[PDB]
Amino acid sequence: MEKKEFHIVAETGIHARPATLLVQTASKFNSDINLEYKGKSVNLKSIMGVMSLGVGQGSDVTITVDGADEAEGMAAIVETLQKEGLA
16 A cells, blocks of 8 residues: 655645546556545545545645555656646
């Protein structure tokens, strides 16, 4: 299992295009991927769950990846977060 805590710097937080893109990236992997914010964990592959979490700028979140391709998944997540200006 891999886990990483990020600090959201984006103006919109995890919403709009960056959120949709992050969700799409997560969905490409077989591993289970969860996003935790304020003690609440959702499936990062689910758009409704992510959008409803209410993650704004300045938020501290933790992403957990668990599965065969977890290493590949974490690497892609970090890249996406950087290119979408999220963390």
